[PDB]
Structure 1
Amino acid sequence: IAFFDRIFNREQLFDQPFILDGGSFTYLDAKGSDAKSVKQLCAGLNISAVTFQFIAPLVQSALGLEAGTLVRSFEVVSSLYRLVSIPQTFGLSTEDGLILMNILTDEMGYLAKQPAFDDKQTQDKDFLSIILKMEALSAWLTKNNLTPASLALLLGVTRLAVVPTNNMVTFFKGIANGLSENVCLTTDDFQRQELEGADWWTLLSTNQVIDDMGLVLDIHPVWGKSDEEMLMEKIQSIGVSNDNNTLSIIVQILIQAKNAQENLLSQTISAEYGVERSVVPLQLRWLGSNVYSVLNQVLNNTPTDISSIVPKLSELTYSLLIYTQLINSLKL
């Protein structure tokens, strides 16, 4: 028996055998009984009916047919067959294949296209290389006990479903409350006879050390050094005075203030997401943000209602959740 006919008329399940013909059908819904019949027989190709609707628009688009229609010809057939079989050869669902293809090319329907050997040879063109890549990465994925959906989400290929919540409101306002409670620095903190030499508070807020709201500014760390060392350096850079003693106590003040602020935030985040306080600050910088900026925004906004939340911070929590998933999945 012919390979084709074997694949479709593998057995008789209906009245008519499937047949390959000219003409088209409104695959989007195929409410027309015959169109539906045709589409169903094609769905007889192993896959779930629902799956069919994910594939068909892409096939139609790639082949250039009218959006609602498909035709009973080898072109449609072969395109579908590619999209089904190829990932299946790696045990990947045809669904998943779309994900990997986008990851590789930012196109889902890539295998819908005809093969090509364009003289304008580019990585996005060799079917064969692309297939080999699919092979390799599939191995790597299973090796690492991953999942294409998870990967795509983490890679930002698709968004995770989230919405504002009462609890997130409570979370933010809780933070703001505790932050207002004692841990926010104040000018009187500098008002000591020992510090009579200058209005440190103003000066340190005119220089980029302090936010007059009562926050220390961010300080990007470095491999070989530690906070007090670079705070020392910052103070030395402003060079207000040579007195090591006043300098020392100033640094002490700044250190402990920072440490309280960051501890508060760290533990709060830890409690919400199940991550260590030890890593929260670094994670935040890897998310591309910092404690100072976060807290600044917090006091700048203090949303009292679910509608009040600034989308900036909503996206912050979204990104945060994402990172938390990543860093929990991997043994970081």
Structure 2
Amino acid sequence: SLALLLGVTRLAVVPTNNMVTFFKGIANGLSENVCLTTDDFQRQELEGADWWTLLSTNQVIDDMGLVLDIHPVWGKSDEEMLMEKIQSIGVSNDNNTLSIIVQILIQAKNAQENLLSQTISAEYGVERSVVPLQLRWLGSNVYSVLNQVLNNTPTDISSIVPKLSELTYSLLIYTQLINSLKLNKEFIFLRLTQPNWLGLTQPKLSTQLSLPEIYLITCYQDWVVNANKNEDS
């Protein structure tokens, strides 16, 4: 198991067309009335998207400016960073026309995330609070997975992109990394936020893992239980 988890003499798997039924299941779940704002989601000048054309009596500027996407950080992430990012990019109209389009956007961000966190939890047996952190710590992005629908993954040819077919294979080994030992999300959240601050070396911003981490994170996972006071001190 330890050699497999360290990635030496790796596993073999079959690309069964059941995988297309799962990705077509994601595309179906995306398509049936979720009406998602993912239409060319991030990249600058977000033009020609339906939602703010209807609400144009309250604010017109659907194209915005720079990107509408997030990287996690410790202690406080959330919609305050999404607000500060759109507030920083040269909007002089600091009145309610700027704040209302944040409270219009929060449920539209949830409608992108909630699909994966509610569905893949029933494929692989992990809690919905772990899924987006597991996905990024594996070396992936929620939109990059959702874009494979636009790359015609739902087509039942017996071939799909490596970006899915090897990602899916890689997810099972990283699932054993979180079940051959059990740990809580705040550890993953710190490890994903700031590796050198946790105590790692700069190359471990990459997806790669080796024994000098595995000793230290395991002996931490003992010490956090062995200590004479509760979790958070």
TM-score by length of 1: 0.48
- Out of 9, 22, 26, the position equivalent to 1:175 is 26
SS at match of 1:173: helix
Residue 161 (structure 2) pairs with residue 161 (structure 1): no
1:317 alignment partner in structure 2: 168
Aligned residues: 171
Q: Which runs of 5+ in 1 are unaligned?
A: 1-149, 210-216
- Out of 127, 138, 141, the position equivalent to 1:276 is 127
RMSD across aligned positions (CA): 1.8
Contact 1:301 1:310 in 2 (8 A): no
Q: 1:188 to 1:279 in 2, by over 3 A?
A: same
- Greater shift after overlay, 294-303 or 276-285? 294-303
Contact 2:121 2:127 in 1 (8 A): yes
CA distance, structure 2, for counterparts of residue 171 and residue 160 of structure 1: 22
Q: Which runs of 5+ in 2 are unaligned?
A: 40-48, 184-233
Contact 2:117 2:128 in 1 (8 A): yes
CA distance, structure 2, for counterparts of residue 329 and residue 168 of structure 1: 25
CA distance, structure 2, for counterparts of residue 326 and residue 306 of structure 1: 32
1:245 alignment partner in structure 2: 96
Deviation at 1:306, TM superposition (A): 5.0
CA distance, structure 2, for counterparts of residue 315 and residue 169 of structure 1: 14
Considering Cα pairs closer than 8 Å and 6+ residues apart, tell me whether 1 or 2 has the greater RCO. 2
TM-score by length of 2: 0.67
Contact 2:21 2:154 in 1 (8 A): no
Contact 1:287 1:323 in 2 (8 A): yes
Residue 157 (structure 2) pairs with residue 296 (structure 1): no
Q: 1:272 to 1:307 in 2, by over 3 A?
A: same
CA distance, structure 1, for counterparts of residue 82 and residue 124 of structure 2: 31
Amino acid at match of 1:208: V
Residue 61 (structure 2) pairs with residue 199 (structure 1): yes
CA distance, structure 1, for counterparts of residue 4 and residue 104 of structure 2: 43
Deviation at 1:229, TM superposition (A): 1.2
Amino acid at match of 2:64: L
- Bigger radius of gyration, 1 or 2? 1
Greater percentage in helix: 1
Contact 1:152 1:158 in 2 (8 A): yes
Contact 1:169 1:305 in 2 (8 A): yes
Contact 2:113 2:142 in 1 (8 A): yes
Residue 188 (structure 2) pairs with residue 329 (structure 1): no
